Design a protein around this ligand. Structure first.
Ligand SMILES: [Cl-]
Ligand SMILES: [Mg+2]
Ligand SMILES: [Mg+2]
Length: 158
């Protein structure tokens, strides 16, 4: 099944953390990376000029169950994302979100697929459109149409 995973980093040098994250994603059992988007840049809010966020999208072919994939993305977030050495308040610096899993709609306490706010997040949809321009959501909405009809922040490449 093809799963689409969003990666975000605001950590240290986001290139290195994101690449470790990609390596870990490929190392998930019964799973392989099909393609990876370009890296995109999201400024922080406010003048503080804290680290920018690096955003990407990955297409992952997997024969895992959705909740099993979630175990792995959660694990990688702990192992690669700091959070032992600095958690709440940080926040955690590496985010791996399962955006879509096949044409599946999953509504469970642990896992909601499609990711609940993804259609309003340009830093999720634009990298997704780069690797899946013909994507259609389980409810039938076309990714190309959402990008024509919803307002998003400008999103430059990294
Ligand atoms: Cl949907
Ligand atoms: Mg997130
Ligand atoms: Mg998350």
């Amino acid at each position: 099944t093809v799963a689409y995973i969003a990666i975000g980093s605001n950590l240290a040098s986001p290139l290195e953390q994101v690449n470790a994250a990609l390596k870990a994603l490929g190392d998930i059992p019964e799973s392989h990376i099909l393609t990876v988007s370009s890296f995109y840049r999201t400024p922080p809010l406010g003048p503080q000029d804290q680290p920018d966020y690096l955003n990407a999208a990955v297409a992952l072919e997997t024969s895992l169950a959705p909740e099993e994939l979630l175990n792995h993305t959660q694990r990688i977030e702990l192992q690669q994302g700091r959070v032992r050495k600095a958690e709440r308040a940080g926040p955690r610096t590496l985010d791996l979100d399962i955006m879509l899993f096949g044409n599946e709609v999953i509504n469970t306490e642990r896992l909601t697929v499609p990711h609940y706010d993804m259609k309003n997040r340009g830093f999720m949809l634009w990298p997704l459109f780069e690797i899946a321009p013909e994507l259609v959501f389980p409810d039938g909405e076309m990714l190309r149409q959402i990008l024509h009809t919803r307002a998003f922040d400008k999103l430059n490449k990294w």
